Design a protein around this nucleic acid. Structure first.
Lengths: 478, 67
DNA sequence: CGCCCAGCGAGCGAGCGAGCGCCGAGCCCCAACCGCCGCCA
């Protein structure tokens, strides 16, 4: 059952708000006095006297007129006498039984017209909005606000003594909290319990946010760190994304986020190792290259798997020795292009050799030549150990343990020093590499090793693991 | 023209009050009244109209009146 | 003669705005530094 919040501002100053009021009315209002009921505990000195009687008479006549014009004396109501910022007011409530919303205005106007020339004896109050109904929206166009039973304990009972003087009603549940703070607090707590029970009954959650999350996830799962691979893999998705104006910065943001997440939490074997199994590995190019040079395919695959996973520790490098165009550069470039963030050693630049090798996954050393000026840092980078370097036109940076591959025709152990050579640093470099004598030359129609071939080779390697002995010279197949 | 708007009448009244009191720089604004400078600065645009009004009042007081 | 249209009105709420606010990208001007030149045995 809804209720209408009728606001009635009770005049405070009878001389300023009700000029010309009869003396008998003021005398009767000042002579009347109330008393705390038997079951009461509120201070009577704080509560006023004449305003209380005025509000009582007002609400009584209002309720009688409502019951007479509605033809329904059996109806629920609720009155509460309070004190505004600088004027007394009330918060009367009447049920909607027999009085619709479209007729509330006419009944209120009739009650207003009946009030004057009867209670005030012709005199009218000066306080604006002395008898109206609370509307929904703030304005003349706002409709009637039909509150509920839960509106009393939510915007009336929580008040205190200075904001609550006397309240009249007929409901049994509210009849006890008419003039008592203990019952008021009890009912307020009992209602707040239910309010909390009903209320009970970071990550951004939105369609665009979830879509972007899934997009960046699926892009990182495929291995697209830049726009180069985005168009190569799926050129339609890039077009669909770039069509939106808001996607311009989002594309770069996703690329940077993927790159950072890979540089922080990702390993090379994850992308190097294929997902689906392989049933025919003999057709692979790496398998043929390894079988033509006499090397055991299974042993070479296990060595590569152990080197990619840093299983050997110090021996975390592979060196393909042999003439040019013998299956070294092909496999090296294939393994370097398969994984994102591949490095490149510039042996020609002795000042900044390990420049393009920071934040990489596969350090490629094409035609390397060890020298006395790059032997110390090389011994640390090849052995899988943290060490700082000096970049070209950039600040220094550390190179975490990352797999390294070398492919050259000259002797890497031989340390060159101008017009001479020394083999002092022979054992340190020999105990940290995997020499692969690839002396057999391939045919002109062999073709380059694609990216899927490396994945299939690594997958077949993971499926067939064998004991790999820590040695410099790899054992050739029988 | 002319154009009437609730957002322009306040600006015109502010310009008139500034020309009447004679606010030269922004320091005198706080001296004459702090609540006004706080309210006009609390807007979303912040300092998009304060400098404009200051320059307008200065130019008006310069071209019209003199020392 | 106690109803008659029936003529009147007073809102009356579900609409209509329109006007502002607060982002949202999107240009725009400005300052701490790079390239190239002057300066002497």
């Amino acid at each position: 059952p809804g209720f209408y919040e009728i606001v009635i501002k009770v005049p405070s100053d009878l001389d300023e708000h009700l000029p010309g009021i009869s003396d008998s009315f003021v005398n009767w209002v000042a002579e009347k006095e109330w008393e705390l009921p038997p079951d009461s505990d509120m201070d009577l000195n704080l509560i006023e006297q004449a305003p209380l009687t005025v509000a009582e008479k007002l609400q009584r006549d209002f309720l009688t007129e409502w019951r007479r014009v509605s033809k329904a004396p059996e109806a629920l109501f609720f009155v509460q006498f309070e004190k505004g910022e600088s004027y007394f007011h009330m918060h009367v409530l009447v049920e909607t039984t027999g009085v619709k919303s479209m007729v509330l205005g006419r009944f209120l106007s009739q009650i207003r017209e009946k009030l004057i020339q009867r209670i005030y004896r012709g005199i009218e109050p000066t306080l604006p909005n002395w008898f109206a109904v609370t509307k929904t929206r703030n304005g003349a166009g706002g409709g009637n606000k039909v509150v509920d039973e839960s509106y009393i304990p939510n915007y009336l009972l929580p008040k205190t003594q200075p904001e609550l003087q006397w309240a009249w009603t007929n409901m049994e549940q509210y009849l006890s909290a008419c003039l008592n703070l203990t019952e008021r607090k009890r009912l307020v707590a009992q209602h707040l319990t239910h309010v909390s029970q009903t209320q009970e009954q970071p990550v951004i959650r939105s369609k665009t946010s979830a879509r972007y999350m899934e997009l960046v996830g699926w892009l990182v799962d495929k291995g697209i760190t830049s726009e180069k691979q985005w168009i190569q893999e799926d050129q339609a998705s890039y077009i669909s994304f770039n069509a939106a104006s808001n996607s311009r910065s989002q594309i770069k943001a996703a690329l940077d986020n993927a790159g950072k997440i890979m540089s922080l939490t990702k390993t090379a074997p994850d992308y190097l190792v294929g997902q689906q199994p392989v049933e025919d590995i003999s057709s692979n190019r790496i398998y043929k290259i390894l079988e033509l040079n006499g090397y055991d395919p299974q042993y070479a695959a296990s060595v590569f798997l152990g080197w990619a996973t840093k299983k050997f520790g110090k021996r975390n490098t592979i060196w393909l020795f042999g003439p040019a165009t013998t299956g070294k550069t092909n496999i090296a470039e294939a393994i370097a292009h398969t994984v994102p963030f591949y490095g490149c050693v510039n042996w020609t630049n002795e000042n900044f050799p390990f420049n393009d090798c920071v934040d990489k996954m596969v350090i490629w050393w094409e035609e390397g030549k060890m020298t006395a000026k790059v032997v110390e840092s090389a011994k640390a980078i090849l052995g899988g150990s943290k060490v700082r370097v000096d970049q070209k036109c950039k600040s220094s940076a550390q190179i975490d343990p990352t797999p390294v591959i070398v492919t050259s025709n000259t002797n890497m152990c031989a340390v060159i020093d101008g017009n001479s050579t020394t083999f002092e640093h022979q054992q340190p470099l020999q105990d940290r590499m995997f020499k692969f004598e690839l002396t057999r030359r391939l045919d002109h129609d062999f073709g380059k090793v694609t990216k899927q071939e490396v994945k299939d080779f690594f997958r077949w390697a993971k499926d067939h693991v064998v004991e790999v002995e820590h040695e410099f010279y790899v054992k050739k197949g029988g």
